Amino acid sequence: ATVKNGTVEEMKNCSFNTTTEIRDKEKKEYALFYKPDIVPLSETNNTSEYRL
Amino acid sequence: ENLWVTVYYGVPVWKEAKTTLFCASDARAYEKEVHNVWATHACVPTDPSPQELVLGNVTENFNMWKNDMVDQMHEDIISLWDQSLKPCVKLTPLCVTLICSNATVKNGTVEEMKNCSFNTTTEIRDKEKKEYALFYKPDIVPLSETNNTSEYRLINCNTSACTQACPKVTFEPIPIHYCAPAGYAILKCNDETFNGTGPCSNVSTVQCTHGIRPVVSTQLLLNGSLAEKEIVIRSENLTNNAKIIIVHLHTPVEIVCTRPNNNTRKSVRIGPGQTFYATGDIIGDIKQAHCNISEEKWNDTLQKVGIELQKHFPNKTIKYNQSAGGDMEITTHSFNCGGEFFYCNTSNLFNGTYNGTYISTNSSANSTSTITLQCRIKQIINMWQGVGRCMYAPPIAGNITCRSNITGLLLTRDGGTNSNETETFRPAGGDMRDNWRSELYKYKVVKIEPLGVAPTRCKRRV
Amino acid sequence: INCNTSACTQACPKVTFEPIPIHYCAPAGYAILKCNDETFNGTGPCSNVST
Amino acid sequence: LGFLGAAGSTMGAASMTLTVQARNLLSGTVWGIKQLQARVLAVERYLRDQQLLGIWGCSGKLICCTNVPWNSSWSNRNLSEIWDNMTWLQWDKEISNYTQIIYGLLEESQNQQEKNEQDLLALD
Amino acid sequence: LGFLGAAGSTMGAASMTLTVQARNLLSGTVWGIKQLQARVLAVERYLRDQQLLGIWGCSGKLICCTNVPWNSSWSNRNLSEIWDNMTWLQWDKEISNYTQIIYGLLEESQNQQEKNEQDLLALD
Ligand SMILES: *[C@@H]1O[C@H](CO)[C@@H](O[C@@H]2O[C@H](CO)[C@@H](O[C@@H]3O[C@H](CO[C@H]4O[C@H](CO)[C@@H](O)[C@H](O)[C@@H]4O)[C@@H](O)[C@H](O)[C@@H]3O)[C@H](O)[C@H]2NC(C)=O)[C@H](O)[C@H]1NC(C)=O
Ligand SMILES: *[C@@H]1O[C@H](CO)[C@@H](O[C@@H]2O[C@H](CO)[C@@H](O[C@@H]3O[C@H](CO)[C@@H](O)[C@H](O)[C@@H]3O)[C@H](O)[C@H]2NC(C)=O)[C@H](O)[C@H]1NC(C)=O
Ligand SMILES: *[C@@H]1O[C@H](CO)[C@@H](O[C@@H]2O[C@H](CO)[C@@H](O[C@@H]3O[C@H](CO)[C@@H](O)[C@H](O)[C@@H]3O)[C@H](O)[C@H]2NC(C)=O)[C@H](O)[C@H]1NC(C)=O
Numbered sequence: 035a036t037v038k039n040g041t042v043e044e045m046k047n048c049s050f051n052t053t054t055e056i057r058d059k060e061k062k063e064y065a066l067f068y069k070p071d072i073v074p075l076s077e078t079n080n081t082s083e084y085r086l
Numbered sequence: 087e088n089l090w091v092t093v094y095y096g097v098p099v100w101k102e103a104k105t106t107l108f109c110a111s112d113a114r115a116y117e118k119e120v121h122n123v124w125a126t127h128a129c130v131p132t133d134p135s136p137q138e139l140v141l142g143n144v145t146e147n148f149n150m151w152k153n154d155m156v157d158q159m160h161e162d163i164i165s166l167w168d169q170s171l172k173p174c175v176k177l178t179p180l181c182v183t184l185i186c187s188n189a190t191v192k193n194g195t196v197e198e199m200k201n202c203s204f205n206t207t208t209e210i211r212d213k214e215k216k217e218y219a220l221f222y223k224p225d226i227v228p229l230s231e232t233n234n235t236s237e238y239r240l241i242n243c244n245t246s247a248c249t250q251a252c253p254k255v256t257f258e259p260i261p262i263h264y265c266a267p268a269g270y271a272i273l274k275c276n277d278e279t280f281n282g283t284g285p286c287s288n289v290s291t292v293q294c295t296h297g298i299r300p301v302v303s304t305q306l307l308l309n310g311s312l313a314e315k316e317i318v319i320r321s322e323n324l325t326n327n328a329k330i331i332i333v334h335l336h337t338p339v340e341i342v343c344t345r346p347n348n349n350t351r352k353s354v355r356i357g358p359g360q361t362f363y364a365t366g367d368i369i370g371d372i373k374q375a376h377c378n379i380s381e382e383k384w385n386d387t388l389q390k391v392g393i394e395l396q397k398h399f400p401n402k403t404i405k406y407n408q409s410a411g412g413d414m415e416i417t418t419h420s421f422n423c424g425g426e427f428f429y430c431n432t433s434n435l436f437n438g439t440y441n442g443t444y445i446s447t448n449s450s451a452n453s454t455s456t457i458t459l460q461c462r463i464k465q466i467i468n469m470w471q472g473v474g475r476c477m478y479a480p481p482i483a484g485n486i487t488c489r490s491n492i493t494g495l496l497l498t499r500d501g502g503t504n505s506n507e508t509e510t511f512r513p514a515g516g517d518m519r520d521n522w523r524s525e526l527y528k529y530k531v532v533k534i535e536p537l538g539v540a541p542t543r544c545k546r547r548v
Numbered sequence: 549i550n551c552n553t554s555a556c557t558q559a560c561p562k563v564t565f566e567p568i569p570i571h572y573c574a575p576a577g578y579a580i581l582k583c584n585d586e587t588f589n590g591t592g593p594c595s596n597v598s599t
Numbered sequence: 600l601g602f603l604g605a606a607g608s609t610m611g612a613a614s615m616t617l618t619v620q621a622r623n624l625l626s627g628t629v630w631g632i633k634q635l636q637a638r639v640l641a642v643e644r645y646l647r648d649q650q651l652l653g654i655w656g657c658s659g660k661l662i663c664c665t666n667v668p669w670n671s672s673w674s675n676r677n678l679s680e681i682w683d684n685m686t687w688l689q690w691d692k693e694i695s696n697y698t699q700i701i702y703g704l705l706e707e708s709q710n711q712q713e714k715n716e717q718d719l720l721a722l723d
Numbered sequence: 724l725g726f727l728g729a730a731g732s733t734m735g736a737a738s739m740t741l742t743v744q745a746r747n748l749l750s751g752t753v754w755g756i757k758q759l760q761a762r763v764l765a766v767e768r769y770l771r772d773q774q775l776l777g778i779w780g781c782s783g784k785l786i787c788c789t790n791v792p793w794n795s796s797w798s799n800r801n802l803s804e805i806w807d808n809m810t811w812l813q814w815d816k817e818i819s820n821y822t823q824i825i826y827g828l829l830e831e832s833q834n835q836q837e838k839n840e841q842d843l844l845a846l847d
Binding site: 087088089090091092093094095096097098099100105106107108127128130136137139141142143144145267268269271273291293534535536537538539540541542544545546548 | 600601602607608614619621626630633636637640641645648655660661662663666668681691694701705712
């Protein structure tokens with residue numbers, strides 16, 4: 035969601051899989067994060083994925 | 087005349103105090119393992135020494151509610167009994183998608199417990215395997231308000247994280263003294279004619295008190311001390327209905343409860359190196375749990391109590407009525423005995439009328455005249471707030487009987503005015519501060535400052 | 549072997565089991581005694597007493 | 600009479616048996632910080648009061664004299680009333696209003712009682 | 724010679740220089756409660772003996788000799804025997820049975836040595 039001709043350091047929207055109050059009723063979740071608090075998983079082509 | 091200011095030490099002078107305290111329980115706090123009995127790290131072997139002694143023309147106001155032993159007793163009960171379930175298994179695996187079925191007497195006058203199953207993670211974390219165990223009927227919430235009549239879950243794990251009460255810890259109410267530190271002294275009265283405040287007549291002093299009973303209940307009062315020969319009512323302000331009346335009798339009325347089902351244990355190994363317990367395949371025919379009370383004596387005790395509340399209510403007739411609405415935790419008589427929790431509704435003790443005419447049961451025609459109390463039973467408990475609420479008691483094996491005595495009642499008045507003759511009297515959800523103040527009110531702790539001043543005609547050399 | 553009894557734990561390499569010696573000493577008020585005679589089979593009096 | 604048995608009776612009858620009220624300030628076991636925080640009461644209560652008694656020059660836990668006179672405005676009653684008829688309770692309750700003055704005078708006046716003891720004892 | 728520098732000797736041989744014993748009754752540093760019960764142990768032990776000694780008027784650790792005659796039936800042996808023939812161990816084991824009575828006698832008979840020696844002195 036980047037504004038390539040911009041100058042602002044905006045946050046990165048991502049999604050993931052989370053437990054719930056029944057431990058085998060999983061469903062995904064979303065929430066945004068400041069970019070200096072997430073590091074990429076691999077130097078490979080599988081870049082879109084990431085992790086805290 | 088000429089005299090000089092002169093100093094005395096060891097002066098018998100005191101002030102009302104607040105302070106950190108001791109405990110003392112008799113020899114029965116020491117024989118068993120660590121972490122049971124709950125005084126075995128702490129309490130000193132008591133002695134009634136120094137002996138109880140009379141005082142002269144002493145006059146002090148024993149205010150019942152302006153005290154810190156009740157506060158202290160609550161903080162100590164809570165803070166020791168909150169950490170005292172830390173060394174145990176603490177659940178999380180069981181917060182699952184149970185699956186159920188029918189073993190249900192479709193129209194029975196019964197409040198039976200349910201059979202369901204669940205997928206168990208065995209001690210090795212990647213060999214999952216199914217298992218089953220029964221569950222008392224309130225404890226489980228359906229997974230969904232939809233047509234998911236199969237899918238069921240425990241009522242916890244959405245609110246908190248709980249604990250299976252280790253069997254090594256017994257919940258039984260062992261008698262406890264509390265005691266004050268050296269340099270502080272405790273006071274007492276012997277007279278039965280107390281009313282809550284004011285200057286007491288027969289003042290006395292003890293090093294520290296008699297054996298208190300920490301039991302936990304809401305409506306009635308079980309195992310504990312007693313008055314002697316008159317019914318006495320203690321309260322702050324009879325003007326307002328918002329506050330609790332506490333009723334002490336001269337004689338106790340005789341109560342007993344039982345669970346006739348013959349429960350058995352069904353043991354599973356869950357998680358590495360720890361074991362879950364559950365109610366097993368129930369043996370014999372299903373029967374309903376309950377309590378039993380003597381109809382003749384409870385009615386006579388009502389007849390003897392009415393004259394006390396007519397000390398201050400001669401313009402209106404006494405009548406008893408049901409617990410004033412609310413949920414499971416306030417409407418019922420909810421206490422414990424014998425390693426499991428009962429929930430029993432006492433409406434069949436609190437309706438009637440006393441209107442002056444006392445007509446005795448004697449000579450008794452039926453001494454077996456009883457009125458029964460039907461009960462549900464639980465394993466999961468939310469015992470208080472701010473105590474580490476969520477707990478699970480494993481079920482005790484076999485069948486039990488807990489014959490006990492109604493030491494006192496907690497009641498509450500219902501309104502009425504403008505040509506009303508029908509005020510009435512209902513149960514009270516006494517808090518633990520409104521449980522144990524029945525058994526701590528006698529004592530007040532004072533602080534000595536034995537340095538003093540007095541006249542004297544001394545002229546030792548300059 | 550475990551995973552049926554209770555949990556285990558790996559001592560970090562810093563916590564070495566160097567049996568590094570230990571003295572003892574009673575508190576003040578109290579004292580320590582000792583005697584040097586070398587015929588004491590568990591009971592009986594002693595002569596060359598020390599502290 | 601123990602800790603408080605001498606109370607209630609008059610100072611005529613409580614001018615003696617002073618020691619039983621001050622002889623016991625210890626008993627019991629160990630329960631961590633939560634019970635150890637009573638043990639150090641001796642610092643707050645006993646040792647402080649003993650230092651009070653010492654700087655007044657009244658070492659020895661018995662009756663002791665001073666050089667500071669009485670005042671009629673403080674109490675004003677006849678000798679027998681205070682001395683034999685009343686008890687320590689109301690005596691503490693009433694005279695506690697002026698304890699600051701008594702403490703200050705007994706504190707500062709001790710300098711006048713130890714001023715020049717080097718020369719008053721050198722030639723003896 | 725420290726804590727037990729004269730054990731086993733006669734009474735006269737160790738009735739002076741007791742300072743080397745009494746001067747040291749406190750020790751240690753930090754290991755939480757389980758050690759700190761040895762720091763406040765001084766209150767439990769030293770101050771108890773100190774107040775027992777001071778209540779009799781024997782404040783100051785001299786050879787304090789005050790009131791009560793020595794009943795002959797307690798030992799019945801001559802002055803020289805108890806003074807310089809006996810040692811402390813069996814003497815304590817023999818007389819420890821009656822000290823609780825002796826302290827009560829010493830403290831209850833103490834008030835009669837001070838009841839009137841403040842105001843009759845004023846007349847003098
Ligand atoms: C950050 O990333 C998130 C995903 O990781 C984004 O969340 C997704 O947002 C889109 C856009 O809203 C959702 O896709 C839409 O879903 C609706 C469903 O709505 C209809 O049905 C509901 C049922 O209650 C009804 O209420 C509505 O009125 C509609 O009738 C579709 O109709 C749309 O066409 C579209 O498919 C995703 O579902 C959602 N994902 C998740 C996992 O929730 C989020 O928007 C991102 N935020 C930013 C700022 O970039
Ligand atoms: C609570 O419900 C569970 C099932 O949801 C009950 O366990 C299952 O009970 C059935 C019926 O007894 C067992 O099936 C039987 O197996 C024997 C094998 O010898 C076979 O000969 C019978 O014809 C029948 O098929 C089933 O095995 C059993 N489940 C497991 C995993 O063993 C359970 O008994 C119920 N508890 C109560 C108290 O009703
Ligand atoms: C588990 O259930 C059994 C059977 O219900 C209990 O055994 C029975 O217990 C009652 C007491 O609750 C016994 O009552 C008898 O009462 C008379 C008084 O009239 C008394 O004289 C006797 O000494 C006796 O106590 C009864 O005899 C006994 N047996 C039967 C067949 O009823 C058992 O006590 C229950 N478990 C527990 C822990 O209470």
